[PDB]
Design an enzyme around this catalytic site. Structure first.
Site, PDB file in Angstrom:
ATOM      1  N   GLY A 238       0.789  -1.229   0.000  1.00 56.65           N
ATOM      2  CA  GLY A 238       0.000   0.000   0.000  1.00 56.65           C
ATOM      3  C   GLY A 238       0.820   1.278   0.000  1.00 56.65           C
ATOM      4  O   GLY A 238       0.330   2.315   0.446  1.00 56.65           O
TER       5      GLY A 238
ATOM      6  N   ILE B  85       3.821  -2.469   8.901  1.00 60.78           N
ATOM      7  CA  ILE B  85       4.956  -2.173   7.998  1.00 60.78           C
ATOM      8  C   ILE B  85       4.718  -0.798   7.312  1.00 60.78           C
ATOM      9  O   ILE B  85       3.800  -0.659   6.500  1.00 60.78           O
ATOM     10  CB  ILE B  85       5.252  -3.335   6.953  1.00 60.78           C
ATOM     11  CG1 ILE B  85       5.477  -4.684   7.650  1.00 60.78           C
ATOM     12  CG2 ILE B  85       6.462  -3.012   6.088  1.00 60.78           C
ATOM     13  CD1 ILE B  85       5.540  -5.922   6.686  1.00 60.78           C
TER      14      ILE B  85
ATOM     15  N   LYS C 257       8.474  21.753 -10.356  1.00 60.86           N
ATOM     16  CA  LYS C 257       9.873  21.429 -10.580  1.00 60.86           C
ATOM     17  C   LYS C 257      10.262  21.669 -12.042  1.00 60.86           C
ATOM     18  O   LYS C 257       9.733  21.012 -12.929  1.00 60.86           O
ATOM     19  CB  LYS C 257      10.152  19.966 -10.204  1.00 60.86           C
ATOM     20  CG  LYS C 257      11.554  19.490 -10.561  1.00 60.86           C
ATOM     21  CD  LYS C 257      11.725  18.018 -10.242  1.00 60.86           C
ATOM     22  CE  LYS C 257      13.014  17.501 -10.847  1.00 60.86           C
ATOM     23  NZ  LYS C 257      12.956  16.015 -11.087  1.00 60.86           N
TER      24      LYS C 257
ATOM     25  N   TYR D 140       6.982  15.685 -27.624  1.00 62.98           N
ATOM     26  CA  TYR D 140       7.856  14.704 -27.006  1.00 62.98           C
ATOM     27  C   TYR D 140       7.267  14.173 -25.692  1.00 62.98           C
ATOM     28  O   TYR D 140       7.269  12.959 -25.450  1.00 62.98           O
ATOM     29  CB  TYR D 140       9.249  15.304 -26.814  1.00 62.98           C
ATOM     30  CG  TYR D 140      10.220  14.459 -26.028  1.00 62.98           C
ATOM     31  CD1 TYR D 140      10.985  13.458 -26.667  1.00 62.98           C
ATOM     32  CD2 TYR D 140      10.399  14.665 -24.637  1.00 62.98           C
ATOM     33  CE1 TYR D 140      11.892  12.675 -25.953  1.00 62.98           C
ATOM     34  CE2 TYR D 140      11.314  13.883 -23.902  1.00 62.98           C
ATOM     35  CZ  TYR D 140      12.058  12.894 -24.576  1.00 62.98           C
ATOM     36  OH  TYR D 140      12.961  12.129 -23.893  1.00 62.98           O
ATOM     37  N   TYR D 141       6.742  15.084 -24.871  1.00 60.87           N
ATOM     38  CA  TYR D 141       6.119  14.705 -23.589  1.00 60.87           C
ATOM     39  C   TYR D 141       4.724  14.095 -23.745  1.00 60.87           C
ATOM     40  O   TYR D 141       4.100  13.741 -22.746  1.00 60.87           O
ATOM     41  CB  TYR D 141       6.119  15.874 -22.573  1.00 60.87           C
ATOM     42  CG  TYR D 141       7.508  16.190 -22.019  1.00 60.87           C
ATOM     43  CD1 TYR D 141       8.246  15.215 -21.317  1.00 60.87           C
ATOM     44  CD2 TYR D 141       8.083  17.458 -22.188  1.00 60.87           C
ATOM     45  CE1 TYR D 141       9.530  15.493 -20.823  1.00 60.87           C
ATOM     46  CE2 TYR D 141       9.365  17.744 -21.704  1.00 60.87           C
ATOM     47  CZ  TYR D 141      10.079  16.769 -21.022  1.00 60.87           C
ATOM     48  OH  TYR D 141      11.323  17.067 -20.526  1.00 60.87           O
TER      49      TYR D 141
ATOM     50  N   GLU E 254       9.394   8.820 -26.150  1.00 63.91           N
ATOM     51  CA  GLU E 254      10.155   9.139 -24.918  1.00 63.91           C
ATOM     52  C   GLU E 254      10.709   7.894 -24.205  1.00 63.91           C
ATOM     53  O   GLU E 254      11.869   7.897 -23.787  1.00 63.91           O
ATOM     54  CB  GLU E 254       9.361  10.008 -23.929  1.00 63.91           C
ATOM     55  CG  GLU E 254      10.192  10.373 -22.700  1.00 63.91           C
ATOM     56  CD  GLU E 254       9.479  11.246 -21.679  1.00 63.91           C
ATOM     57  OE1 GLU E 254       8.224  11.350 -21.685  1.00 63.91           O
ATOM     58  OE2 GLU E 254      10.201  11.845 -20.858  1.00 63.91           O
TER      59      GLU E 254
END
Ligand SMILES: Cc1cc2nc3c(=O)[nH]c(=O)nc-3n(C[C@H](O)[C@H](O)[C@H](O)COP(=O)(O)OP(=O)(O)OC[C@H]3O[C@@H](n4cnc5c(N)ncnc54)[C@H](O)[C@@H]3O)c2cc1C
Ligand SMILES: Cc1cc2nc3c(=O)[nH]c(=O)nc-3n(C[C@H](O)[C@H](O)[C@H](O)COP(=O)(O)OP(=O)(O)OC[C@H]3O[C@@H](n4cnc5c(N)ncnc54)[C@H](O)[C@@H]3O)c2cc1C
Ligand SMILES: N[C@@H](Cc1c[nH]c2ccccc12)C(=O)O
Ligand SMILES: N[C@@H](Cc1c[nH]c2ccccc12)C(=O)O
Ligand SMILES: [Cl-]
Ligand SMILES: [Cl-]
Ligand SMILES: [Cl-]
Ligand SMILES: [Cl-]
Lengths: 516, 516
Positions: B12, B41, B78, B442-443, B449
């Protein structure tokens, strides 16, 4: 380092004059270029069918549109290769034909139409793949042009042309822009102790020097093989043919039309090309001497077309394979001096301009950095070997077993790891490499087409044509009923376009005559 | 064959909920999907920086635009990775920084601008490559947004986000579309005699069965490594780091702004990430235990940011490498159970959705044809190893020699044949792989890609950044003075755009606040 100033090309065939033109254009005439050609050594005489990157990569580069070059070379149109009698042991009561077409098969929700066609074919659907997935095959049956009468293009296409006329056309273009044409014959090649070509001695006593030597000398490979001693990797373990008997044949265009494609008609011990243009078609029986004599192949060829015992013929032999390295020291081989592959795929002239493009991408200075030639060499190896494998796949996929030649093809060929892997993926139901670009974009992006030369649709055309299909349709499609219905809509569009083209295209004959 | 009906995902974390979402979407809910996750965990706690295909390949697929997911995960922007103190032995009197940017460098007459920049650099030109060849680096220095205030995008960008929030967001999305969430812990795995997973036994006594098992269990690889015994290829001969000390650090956004990029700040025995978002940045010192202790690395990390001895920390260890095979029998590993590479390149989450895309392209039926998994496996190997090599190139190209860690990187790494060849071509002056597409195309073309992931501009950014340049500019340019002048025009345009962006972009801080 000093730049390349002086360039000598040996060879006045299609390669020599392509090289001279392309370098005249690429080096902004900032280069002394000399081509030497022997009057006693004829051009090969063949190479008349092409692929669409001829316009984009070569002629556009020189600034020559179709409308300028075509009329001067007896240009005609090619929309496909049609394969006849390839699939089964031939039966004159049966129509065994399939098309290998230019352009790309549409996608539907990320899956090629070929895959939706196959799922239908599992459920009993009878129409052939290329007639389902492409709108033009029926138009090609009807011998129709690739354009409307006003010039508007309606399908992807390439060209047929006269081999001699193309070279002569390019000769005039290059000579007029300052290429020095020397009619003489290279008799000796002098190497320094480090093994670089120093000079050429000619039959009439000239000594030719240069910074860069281009070997366009044909199959002999005068510079690359004979002087520099570069190994030729013979590939007769991969492909069996080694010979051809060739001629031009008159056509009754007004009675019979002009087929807008190349035919590949399978024979007893090889196959025959047919390359229609106005007035005539070029034809040639590509054969293996291990299975038939040249005398018999000549008889078979004449019989096919009903030609006379008096008809003069272009008798050819060849070796299948390529040089270990295309570019060695100060010498780049281009054309038949570099490599050869039988014209099943019409890539011989493609190899010329593809290598010329790659040489300019890796262009040296006078120091000949080996890293530039190494990188160039590796592009050539990949280019050739992939095409070799694609050609070989027609042969190992056929079901013909009517002669020793076809049996040997079924059972006795050496297959690369690369081709086996591709075949494996195909048989599993997987598409091979696909593009999301349209035809125009793909035929305009050479760095893309160069690396992605053979696509899913190319392999499907050949494999489905020869009657070898995957074990299974794509498992994913059992989860995607809406996509299957959307693909049916796309099949309906293709069928509408096919009908429109039928009533809208002029015949290839009439269109060609109208051009002139 | 029967289709895949029942799917169980173990894990998860980000991988588990990415897998659950992507398969809920791809299999048109024609699938019973169960995810099991252990309360005892924890998730790894990190993975907060991304690349632009996150939107195109993943979220667009689910039909979730940026404006929908971003606000729910503390999303920020970013535009690059900025590398600090990577090039030379650090000197606080000197500014050692370079950007690795998203998007592609323009071409001029078939040659990348990087190559025209280098020729200028030979003649003494001082400006850094990325400031010459891209219009945004100065804007990133000024901490400006990647959009105008009204939302209009002005540069290629990706995202920063909270790791826990992204998983929880995806949990809600998948559960609402019928994914069965089980909070329990797999204690045993039962295989049949042929070696396929039969069932999972849980801690609370459940027996889980399925047609397809997805292992998203994290580094332990419960199904793929522990049950099926697939070898992990440890790659600590290629890359030295094996640990990280990580935390979130408060930021005075109103005083200091929000950096529109990830920083990579080179340390004594590894490097530190910085991942700004509103209010806080995620940070982590990636280090090698062979060169520094965790205790020392912890001290260095705290000192960097002026943190307190009381500040609780996310202490991580990891193994570099990948499984020999990602998909074995009826089990596909996805995420940390598949592979790991330090985040120098921010590709961990990329590996999740790239594998999910590839699984759907190779989707099985209940007979698990090995040809489908083989072909899938080979796509994963190429994907990982190419990224591994690209990451390693930062390390073997650095000139730092101030510590044993940097010396070992300079001299002691095992390099692939593939990376050596690329480096060879670079040093010769050759562009590496280039595209003629714009950023958007391209993206938007993932099959392109995916195979063409690292381009000329990626390698140039890193290599020129670290101060390793080719021996020589491209010989061809000495024949192309008009192209050189046309490239100057392009450099002038970039500079105009840089100035426009300076006075037009809002700050990243203000823009983020305006979103909310
Ligand atoms: C049977 C066959 C079928 C083909 N079909 C196709 C096809 O359908 N489509 C396609 O695209 N391609 C095809 N090709 C390939 C095509 O013919 C060639 O790629 C193209 O014609 C280039 O030939 P070339 O210039 O390299 O060699 P050549 O035409 O052989 O020219 C050699 C030149 O070098 C000169 N020369 C040699 N030695 C010397 C010397 N000592 N001194 C001075 N000059 C010298 C010769 O005089 C001549 O000018 C086919 C080839 C063959 C053999
Ligand atoms: C130090 C570090 C830095 C990183 N930086 C970046 C970055 O900057 N950008 C980027 O894109 N990626 C980065 N990554 C990668 C990123 O963290 C992961 O790709 C992503 O978070 C997926 O993690 P995961 O789900 O595979 O594993 P985990 O987060 O470890 O999740 C494991 C899950 O499996 C469950 N589980 C395990 N065993 C059992 C069992 N027995 N029974 C039931 N459930 C079980 C656990 O409870 C947990 O839910 C980084 C990774 C590390 C280690
Ligand atoms: N990329 C090539 C593929 C090709 C080579 N030879 C062919 C012959 C027929 C059809 C397609 C081809 C093209 O479409 O031009
Ligand atoms: N094709 C990737 C290349 C890449 C991966 N990680 C990066 C980090 C910074 C810049 C570019 C990248 C992209 O532009 O998204
Ligand atoms: Cl050919
Ligand atoms: Cl296709
Ligand atoms: Cl990462
Ligand atoms: Cl680029």
């Amino acid at each position: 380092n000093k730049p390349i100033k002086n360039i000598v090309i040996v060879g006045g065939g299609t390669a020599g004059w392509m090289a001279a033109s392309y370098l005249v254009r690429a080096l902004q005439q900032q280069a002394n270029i000399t081509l030497i050609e022997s009057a006693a050594i004829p051009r090969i005489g063949v190479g008349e069918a092409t692929i669409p990157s001829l316009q984009k990569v070569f002629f556009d580069f020189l600034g020559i549109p179709e409308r300028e070059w075509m009329p001067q070379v007896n240009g005609a149109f090619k929309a496909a290769i049609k394969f006849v009698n390839w699939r089964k042991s031939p039966d004159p009561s049966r129509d065994d034909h399939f098309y290998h077409l230019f352009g790309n098969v549409p996608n539907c929700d990320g899956v090629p139409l070929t895959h939706y066609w196959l799922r239908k074919r599992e459920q009993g659907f009878q129409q052939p793949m290329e007639y389902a997935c492409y709108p033009q095959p029926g138009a090609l049956d009807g011998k129709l042009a690739p354009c409307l009468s006003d010039g508007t293009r309606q399908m992807s296409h390439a060209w047929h042309f006269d081999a001699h006329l193309v070279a002569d056309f390019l000769k005039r273009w290059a000579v007029e822009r300052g290429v020095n044409r020397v009619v003489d014959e290279v008799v000796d090649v002098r190497l320094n102790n480090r093994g670089y070509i120093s000079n050429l001695l000619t039959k009439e006593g000239r000594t030719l020097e240069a910074d860069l030597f281009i070997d366009c000398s044909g199959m002999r490979g005068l510079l690359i093989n004979q002087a520099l001693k570069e190994p030729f990797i013979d590939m007769s373990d991969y492909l069996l043919c080694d010979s051809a008997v060739a001629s031009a044949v008159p056509n009754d265009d007004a009675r019979d039309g002009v087929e807008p494609y190349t035919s590949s008609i399978a024979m007893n011990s090889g196959w025959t090309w047919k390359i229609p243009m106005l007035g005539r078609f070029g034809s040639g029986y590509v054969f293996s001497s291990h299975f038939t004599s040249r005398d018999q192949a000549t008889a078979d060829f004449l019989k096919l077309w009903g030609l006379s015992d008096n008809q003069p013929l272009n008798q050819i032999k060849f070796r299948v394979g390529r040089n270990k390295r295309a570019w060695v020291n100060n010498c780049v081989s281009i054309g038949l001096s570099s490599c050869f592959l039988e014209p099943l795929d019409s890539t011989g002239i493609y190899f010329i301009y593809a290598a010329l493009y790659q040489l300019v991408k890796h262009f040296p200075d006078t120091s000949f950095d080996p890293r530039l030639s190494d990188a160039f060499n590796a592009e050539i190896v990949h280019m050739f070997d992939d095409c070799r494998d694609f050609v070989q796949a027609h042969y190992f996929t056929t079901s013909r077993d009517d002669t020793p030649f076809w049996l040997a093809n079924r059972h006795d060929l050496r297959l690369s790891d690369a081709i086996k892997e591709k075949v494996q993926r195909y048989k599993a139901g997987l598409p091979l490499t696909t593009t999301s670009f349209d035809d125009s974009t793909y035929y305009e992006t050479f760095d893309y087409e160069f690396k992605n030369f053979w696509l899913n649709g190319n392999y499907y055309c050949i494999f489905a044509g020869l009657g070898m299909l995957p074990d299974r349709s794509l498992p994913l499609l059992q989860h995607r009923p809406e996509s299957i219905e959307k693909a049916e809509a796309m099949f309906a569009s293709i069928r509408r376009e096919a009908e429109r083209l039928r009533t809208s295209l002029p015949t290839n004959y009439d269109y060609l005559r109208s051009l002139r």
